[PDB]
Amino acid sequence: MRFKKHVVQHEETMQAIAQRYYGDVSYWIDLVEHNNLKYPYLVETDEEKMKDPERLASTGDTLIIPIESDLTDVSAKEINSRDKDVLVELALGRDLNITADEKYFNEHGTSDNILAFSTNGNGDLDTVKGIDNMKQQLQARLLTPRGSLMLHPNYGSDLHNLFGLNIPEQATLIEMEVLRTLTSDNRVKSANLIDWKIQGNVYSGQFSVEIKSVEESINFVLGQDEEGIFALFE
Amino acid sequence: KTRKLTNILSKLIDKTMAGTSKITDFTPGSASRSLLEAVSLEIEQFYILTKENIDWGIQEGIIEAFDFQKRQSKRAYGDVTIQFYQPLDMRMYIPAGTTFTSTRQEYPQQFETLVDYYAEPDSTEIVVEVYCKETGVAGNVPEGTINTIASGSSLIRSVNNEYSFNTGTKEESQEDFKRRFHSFVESRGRATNKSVRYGALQIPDVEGVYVYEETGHITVFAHDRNGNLSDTLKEDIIDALQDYRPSGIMLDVTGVEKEEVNVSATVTISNKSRIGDTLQKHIESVIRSYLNNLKTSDDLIITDLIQAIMNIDDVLIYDVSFDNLDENIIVPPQGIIRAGEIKVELK
Amino acid sequence: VYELRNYSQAKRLFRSGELLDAIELAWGSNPNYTAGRILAMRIEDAKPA
């Protein structure tokens, strides 16, 4: 259950509040009855409220409006930028940082024993959030061979076997495998080739990944309020 | 009974139209309609005020005249002392809503000030008033409970409430208020068997009163906790019933026909090693308590006494028997049973 | 100088005072345009016990 709570504003009236919220002034008597208010409902200052603190409310006192409010179906335009940042952060999850020391496991991508946990510098375990989290998960999936992870046959990639010849065919195989691996992630809305080239031994390519938009993540997290889990089991 | 907003507005418009035809626009946003709507809102608010006043008067107007106060639910409030390490080096300001709390699990109640306060520079300790956030008796914290401020400056040496809070109350129901009024009204009655009995019972040492009525005579049986009626208590009862008795009728006071029952019991027991003086005295004290607990019209049923004695212990006490008690001792309304000589034989 | 993002971080750092109230006001001044990464400083030349 959730309800709206209104702070009394300067020289406000109960009729104005009723019109503002219920869309009709007629509910002002219901508002009085629910809040248990005496006749001078909104006193000028606290000196009047001292006469009867129980039954009177002054400026800056909080009223309760029993309208069933719900965090979903709320216009994203009202939400504050920091609130949107936190919401997308929750949507994309928090996880322990393992992709630290990028250079090392970039020098040995195909091998095992390549990544490890790290500390945040404050004596606690390091954590990656939001975009850093997505980076970590996409790197780990691409680096993981498919079928090597226990309890998860399909998680991973087949790039360890695509160390083939230097022709456009193997390039296309790599590209298709990478697109499969990126598509496998639920959060990745789509992925597509940008550009590739061959330099004899070395292959080089780059991709573009569109994560779910702020609106979708906001809708998902605010929907999750009904359950209260606020966690990711994808 | 009362008009309402739409009806007041409609009548205002109709009267305005009838008064003059110079105004005919009564659409939304019109100055004239806005003014009439504002008057209508004020009148509707005064109607609600009258309704509240009359609803209060219906249930509290009459009884209030007889010095009977209905207990309203209140927030517990009281004074607290704040001490500073030194005289203040500037005007300190404590805003309204400043919270005070206690460092105990016994009292999670939160107290806050409802008004602004100022401490002068010259001051060294200032007292303020705090109100419990919750109505009820839960805010009636004892002395020395409030000892913390959640938004106070470091200059404070110590917070402390100098007296226990007692103003927190729970709302008294209407039926209890009516019951007290009706009780008082009944107590105004006089010159009746019920009123005599009531006036006798109000005496401190009187435990139980039976009034027996005869044509032209009244006799009052009274007893104390012990079943006795002291001469002094008798004189007090007479003096108190001088105001109660009818005119031209004779009133007499007498003791209750006490009956001391002597009970010699033979208790069979299982655990022979636990036989001793203490168990004997315990059983005898139980029997004496049972016998003395009986009221004026209560008959001594022997089977219930046996039940009680066997319920002292369901396995230790084996069997009981009495030689004095052969059959239930019926007594009249004016004859109380009391504990006489008691003996218990362990077998 | 310190970098602040959360109110709990400022409460841990700044125990009380007007500065903490100013940080709270700044992160609650407007419903839709509260600021971020507020930079705070203590002017008191205090010493530890």
PDB file of C-alpha atoms in Angstrom, chain C:
ATOM      1  CA  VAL C   1      37.794  19.586   0.125  1.00  0.00           C
ATOM      2  CA  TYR C   2      35.510  16.561  -0.293  1.00  0.00           C
ATOM      3  CA  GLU C   3      33.247  15.265  -3.069  1.00  0.00           C
ATOM      4  CA  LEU C   4      29.704  14.422  -1.967  1.00  0.00           C
ATOM      5  CA  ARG C   5      27.087  12.375  -3.797  1.00  0.00           C
ATOM      6  CA  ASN C   6      24.863  10.878  -1.062  1.00  0.00           C
ATOM      7  CA  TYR C   7      23.349  12.312   2.108  1.00  0.00           C
ATOM      8  CA  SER C   8      24.677   9.410   4.169  1.00  0.00           C
ATOM      9  CA  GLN C   9      28.206  10.266   3.006  1.00  0.00           C
ATOM     10  CA  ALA C  10      27.811  13.866   4.148  1.00  0.00           C
ATOM     11  CA  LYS C  11      26.293  12.781   7.462  1.00  0.00           C
ATOM     12  CA  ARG C  12      29.243  10.471   8.100  1.00  0.00           C
ATOM     13  CA  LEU C  13      31.710  13.200   7.137  1.00  0.00           C
ATOM     14  CA  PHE C  14      29.959  16.299   8.508  1.00  0.00           C
ATOM     15  CA  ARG C  15      28.430  15.246  11.820  1.00  0.00           C
ATOM     16  CA  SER C  16      26.169  18.296  12.110  1.00  0.00           C
ATOM     17  CA  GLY C  17      26.114  22.068  11.634  1.00  0.00           C
ATOM     18  CA  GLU C  18      24.683  24.524   9.156  1.00  0.00           C
ATOM     19  CA  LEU C  19      26.780  23.096   6.294  1.00  0.00           C
ATOM     20  CA  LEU C  20      24.955  19.761   6.464  1.00  0.00           C
ATOM     21  CA  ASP C  21      21.632  21.623   6.421  1.00  0.00           C
ATOM     22  CA  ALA C  22      22.813  23.533   3.333  1.00  0.00           C
ATOM     23  CA  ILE C  23      23.777  20.306   1.574  1.00  0.00           C
ATOM     24  CA  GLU C  24      20.342  18.873   2.368  1.00  0.00           C
ATOM     25  CA  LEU C  25      18.587  22.022   1.142  1.00  0.00           C
ATOM     26  CA  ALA C  26      20.663  21.992  -2.057  1.00  0.00           C
ATOM     27  CA  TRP C  27      19.719  18.367  -2.830  1.00  0.00           C
ATOM     28  CA  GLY C  28      16.114  19.252  -1.953  1.00  0.00           C
ATOM     29  CA  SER C  29      15.813  22.842  -3.160  1.00  0.00           C
ATOM     30  CA  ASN C  30      13.746  21.922  -6.265  1.00  0.00           C
ATOM     31  CA  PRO C  31      11.712  18.791  -7.123  1.00  0.00           C
ATOM     32  CA  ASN C  32      13.141  18.522 -10.673  1.00  0.00           C
ATOM     33  CA  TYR C  33      16.583  20.185 -10.688  1.00  0.00           C
ATOM     34  CA  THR C  34      18.562  19.123  -7.629  1.00  0.00           C
ATOM     35  CA  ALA C  35      22.314  19.551  -8.040  1.00  0.00           C
ATOM     36  CA  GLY C  36      25.079  16.945  -7.833  1.00  0.00           C
ATOM     37  CA  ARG C  37      28.707  16.395  -6.802  1.00  0.00           C
ATOM     38  CA  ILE C  38      28.499  19.151  -4.201  1.00  0.00           C
ATOM     39  CA  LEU C  39      31.916  20.254  -2.920  1.00  0.00           C
ATOM     40  CA  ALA C  40      31.981  21.046   0.800  1.00  0.00           C
ATOM     41  CA  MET C  41      34.498  22.443   3.274  1.00  0.00           C
ATOM     42  CA  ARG C  42      34.775  23.042   7.025  1.00  0.00           C
ATOM     43  CA  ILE C  43      35.993  26.505   8.052  1.00  0.00           C
ATOM     44  CA  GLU C  44      36.549  25.646  11.738  1.00  0.00           C
ATOM     45  CA  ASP C  45      40.229  25.290  12.716  1.00  0.00           C
ATOM     46  CA  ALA C  46      39.340  22.376  14.985  1.00  0.00           C
ATOM     47  CA  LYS C  47      41.683  19.832  16.609  1.00  0.00           C
ATOM     48  CA  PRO C  48      41.161  16.216  17.724  1.00  0.00           C
ATOM     49  CA  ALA C  49      40.840  15.106  21.320  1.00  0.00           C
TER      50      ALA C  49
END
